[PDB]
């Protein structure tokens, strides 16, 4: 029971069953999917034909593309329900500029590392306001507030955070921004040139001040989550990594394995995949960070168009991780258990036929639930 035994088992089971890997019965899927799709069924004419059409066009058995959900489903199988809940209680550890912290957190045993990457969600626009009118329990949040004697940041929670500016400095910037369109405007507009007018120079100076103080404030929000699997090998440099992931409105974990991207990421090496991932959090280059962010997180094949144009990752990025050893005697026992539950409730020769039987039962329970609901006109 090697670590590459379980890696190949999840790889073929996810490639062939998809949502069935979660263990949820088809009846519950169709019952809850009817809750979302009830507003699309037509109410006139033959109701059996109206319900059948919406039932046919639903993607309820399509695997999830929530990156955080695919990471949860991988942890439940390899670690077990209780082991994964204990794993969640642990905290993440930020990666440094060279990824040495993760490089040292990988002993030569079977390991599972979950990665939570955050995007810097710094505020993008300000507002002049008199202190009389400033109620921090009602005013718009994640915004810079320039008062006549204080420049302050309202975070995402309610907390007011001073930016260390003199009352005289704030009085100068307050009375310099005078045009009505700029009293509630953005901080870093590219068309604002400080050499044109004295008003715009004060806006640009305010941007440089906010951009400096925001570096010491926690403004990160999670933008992606994935999973990496490290099997136990006879060391040397026969050590390999295999990352698991899905992505919002992009691809599923089933498509991830089907495209063999976990293997294009494999032979990149232990230190190779880590060095380029620490790279991603360091560089300020805008057109030379999206290349990586696509190189590791795109659907299989489209590593060259995943981060272009407006999807071009501008904001700074951080990556975090946490590790725990896996016991293959329990992981494979959890996997063949789902194979047993699948082969029992929905048996068949081909795995493609076992999925068809699961789709029909989900469509049957969704149908009966829909016609019961639509009896109210």
């Amino acid at each position: 029971k090697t670590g590459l035994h379980v890696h190949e088992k999840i790889k073929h089971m996810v490639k062939n069953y998809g949502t069935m890997i979660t263990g949820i019965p088809a009846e519950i899927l169709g019952q809850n999917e009817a809750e979302i799709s009830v507003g699309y069924v037509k109410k006139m004419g033959n109701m059996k034909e109206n319900i059948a059409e919406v039932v046919r066009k639903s993607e309820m058995t399509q695997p999830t593309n929530s990156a955080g959900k695919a990471s949860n489903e991988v942890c439940d199988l390899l670690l077990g329900t209780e082991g994964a809940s204990e794993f969640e209680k642990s905290s993440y550890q930020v990666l440094s500029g060279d990824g040495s912290n993760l490089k040292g957190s990988l002993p030569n045993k079977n390991l599972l590392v979950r990665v939570e990457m955050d995007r810097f969600n710094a505020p993008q626009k300000y507002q002049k306001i008199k202190r009389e009118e400033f109620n921090p329990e009602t005013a718009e949040k994640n915004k810079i507030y320039l008062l006549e004697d204080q420049l302050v940041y309202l975070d995402i929670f309610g907390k007011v955070i001073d930016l260390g500016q003199t009352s005289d400095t704030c009085h100068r910037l307050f009375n310099a921004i005078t045009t009505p369109f700029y009293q509630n405007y953005i901080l870093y507009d590219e068309y604002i040139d400080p050499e044109e007018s004295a008003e715009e120079a004060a806006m640009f100076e305010m941007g440089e001040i906010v951009k400096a103080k925001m570096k010491n404030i926690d403004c990160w929000t999670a933008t992606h989550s994935f999973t990496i699997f490290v099997p136990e090998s006879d060391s040397e440099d026969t050590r390999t990594l295999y990352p698991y992931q899905a992505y919002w409105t992009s691809h599923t974990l089933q498509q991830w394995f089907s495209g063999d991207k976990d293997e294009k990421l494999s032979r990149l090496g232990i230190d190779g995949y880590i060095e380029k991932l620490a790279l991603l959090g360091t560089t300020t280059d805008s057109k030379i960070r999206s290349s990586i962010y696509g190189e590791l997180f795109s659907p299989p094949g489209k590593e060259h168009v995943f981060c272009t144009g407006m999807n071009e990752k501008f904001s700074p990025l951080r990556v975090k991780f946490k590790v725990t050893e896996v016991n293959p005697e329990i992981a494979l026992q959890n996997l063949e258990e789902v194979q047993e539950f699948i082969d029992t409730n929905y048996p068949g020769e081909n795995a493609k036929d076992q999925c068809e039987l699961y789709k029909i039962k989900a469509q049957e329970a969704m149908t009966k639930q829909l016609e019961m609901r639509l009896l109210i006109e």
Binding site: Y40, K125, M310
Partner: protein, 150 residues
Amino acid sequence: GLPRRIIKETQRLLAEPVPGIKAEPDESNARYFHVVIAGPQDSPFEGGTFKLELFLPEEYPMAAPKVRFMTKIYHPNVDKLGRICLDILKDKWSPALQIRTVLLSIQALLSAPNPDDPLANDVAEQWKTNEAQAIETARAWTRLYAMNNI
């Protein structure tokens, strides 16, 4: 009372237009833009001229521009009213973006249509299930609506 950037953005759009996109402000509403996007090559819209009307709201640039097709088009992310389902005009619009970025997206959206909910849009289901015939539909709508309409 035109804001200074909307003035600056208009002059940039007229000095270096996006290749294949004609964008000019209205003679009476400087916040209103008349857009003509040419059909990309290697696409069922090739050879077509599609009219769009972009309006810069008053919250612009803190809010995304309101754009919408005026020519009938068979696209999975454009409904019957002409609304373009893009990730900019919805939630993740940022002040770093601008008009040219929006125009470039819509042009890129014609070449690479996105997946969509097959419900409340028979065009999206037809593109996912019967692509070759949905592409055949778009070539018909391009000759009927997007040719000799300027």
